[PDB]
Amino acid sequence: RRGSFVEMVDNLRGKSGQGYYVEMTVGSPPQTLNILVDTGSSNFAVGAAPHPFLHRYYQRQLSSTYRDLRKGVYVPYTQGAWAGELGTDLVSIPHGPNVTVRANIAAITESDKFFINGSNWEGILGLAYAEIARPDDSLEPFFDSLVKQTHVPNLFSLQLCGAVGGSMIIGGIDHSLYTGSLWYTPIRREWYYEVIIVRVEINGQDLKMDCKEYNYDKSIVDSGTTNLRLPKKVFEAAVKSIKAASSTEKFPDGFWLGEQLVCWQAGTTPWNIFPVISLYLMGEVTNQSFRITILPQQYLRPVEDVATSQDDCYKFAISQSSTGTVMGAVIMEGFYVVFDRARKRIGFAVSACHVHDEFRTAAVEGPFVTLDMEDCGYN
Numbered sequence: 001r002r003g004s005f006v007e008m009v010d011n012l013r014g015k016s017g018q019g020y021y022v023e024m025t026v027g028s029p030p031q032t033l034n035i036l037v038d039t040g041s042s043n044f045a046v047g048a049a050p051h052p053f054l055h056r057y058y059q060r061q062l063s064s065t066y067r068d069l070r071k072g073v074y075v076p077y078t079q080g081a082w083a084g085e086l087g088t089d090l091v092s093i094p095h096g097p098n099v100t101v102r103a104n105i106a107a108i109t110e111s112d113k114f115f116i117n118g119s120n121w122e123g124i125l126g127l128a129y130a131e132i133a134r135p136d137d138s139l140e141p142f143f144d145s146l147v148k149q150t151h152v153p154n155l156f157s158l159q160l161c162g163a164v165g166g167s168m169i170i171g172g173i174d175h176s177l178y179t180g181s182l183w184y185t186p187i188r189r190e191w192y193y194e195v196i197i198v199r200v201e202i203n204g205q206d207l208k209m210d211c212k213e214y215n216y217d218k219s220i221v222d223s224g225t226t227n228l229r230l231p232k233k234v235f236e237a238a239v240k241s242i243k244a245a246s247s248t249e250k251f252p253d254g255f256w257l258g259e260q261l262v263c264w265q266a267g268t269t270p271w272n273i274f275p276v277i278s279l280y281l282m283g284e285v286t287n288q289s290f291r292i293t294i295l296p297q298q299y300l301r302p303v304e305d306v307a308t309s310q311d312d313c314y315k316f317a318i319s320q321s322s323t324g325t326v327m328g329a330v331i332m333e334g335f336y337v338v339f340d341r342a343r344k345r346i347g348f349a350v351s352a353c354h355v356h357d358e359f360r361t362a363a364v365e366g367p368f369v370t371l372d373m374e375d376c377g378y379n
């Protein structure tokens with residue numbers, strides 16, 4: 001109920017659907033920049049040269065504590081890519097832990113489709129593990145540096161509040177950010193924050209696919225990805241089931257593909273006609289699982305208003321992936337997510353800020369009995 005971590009509450013902001021960021025201060029004298037919180041990568045990188053979409057950037061020549069590592073780095077993602085120069089400098093998070101560490105920093109000099117116009121963030125904080133760090137696993141990620149240089153507990157939690165703000169509690173958990181109990185799923189392997197999905201339901205109806213399909217290749221949690229991305233076969237089956245459940249009103253095929261938007265008169269969106277989606281995750285005890293349930297308010301995302309008009313346009317935010325399942329903002333916005341690195345697990349709880357209506361709410365429920373969950377993982 002109380003809050004020793006109060007100063008970290010509400011330390012995240014966003015330009016409505018374009019990325020959640022936290023202020024980070026680098027160098028000496030202080031150079032503060034808006035940094036995207038990204039659990040799907042492991043590099044700390046900041047724009048360090050003028051760019052059309054950047055309001056400000058890191059100026060190495062002005063930082064007396066900057067150290068050039070004399071090595072370049074190239075980082076390609078599913079969406080976007082950037083190139084920079086590696087170095088190290090002092091880094092602090094004003095509304096985060098009360099510490100200052102020397103971390104690796106990639107100065108972004110060139111990029112393609114990475115920065116987003118009007119997003120207001122100028123860098124990215126890769127919170128995942130060294131295994132996926134570029135150029136290789138020897139480039140210590142920011143959080144690894146934080147834990148090794150300070151006494152800050154090896155854990156952080158995220159509360160992303162969509163339609164924009166949120167909280168990134170570093171070193172602990174704040175009880176005002178969630179209701180109900182926290183349910184944990186094992187971090188299968190320490191590279192991306194990999195998890196295992198054991199069952200999927202649409203309005204209580206089992207998609208009935210071999211659970212291996214749900215994690216085909218892998219299933220990860222990524223705060224830097226907008227959608228709930230699913231492997232091709234799973235995506236197709238999910239869409240067919242969602243379409244059937246929302247038969248009250250028909251939509252063009254492109255809508256389900258994200259190629260067409262559908263808009264409703266201001267405040268008339270019939271959320272009730274769309275089904276809830278449940279993802280069952282492996283639990284911490286043998287044959288035990290739990291489920292997280294999201295509402296259409298999470299998977300149907302608003303598209304930057306034309307200019308404060310009377311038309312609420314939405315995009316179906318569940319899409320296909322060829323690299324496994326990605327639990328992006330669509331999933332995270334309905335919950336308070338605890339990245340308990342110390343205990344190699346991720347916790348989910350109903351968010352105190354998730355968007356819902358007067359009839360339904362996002363939920364985290366358990367326990368359930370699920371056999372052979374170990375076979376669901378790809379090898």
Ligand SMILES: C[C@@H](NC(=O)c1cc(-c2nnc([C@](C)(N)Cc3ccccc3)o2)cc(N(C)S(C)(=O)=O)c1)c1ccc(F)cc1
Nearest residue numbers: 017018019040041077078079080223224225226227319329
């Ligand atoms: C910021 C922005 N992200 C994207 O717009 C986006 C990133 C990646 C995406 N791929 N890989 C990533 C990394 C590892 N997160 C790195 C990264 C961060 C920012 C920008 C690009 C890349 O994200 C993939 C997609 N898709 C293909 S999608 C449409 O979601 O299916 C979209 C975002 C994040 C949270 C949020 F609430 C709203 C908007």
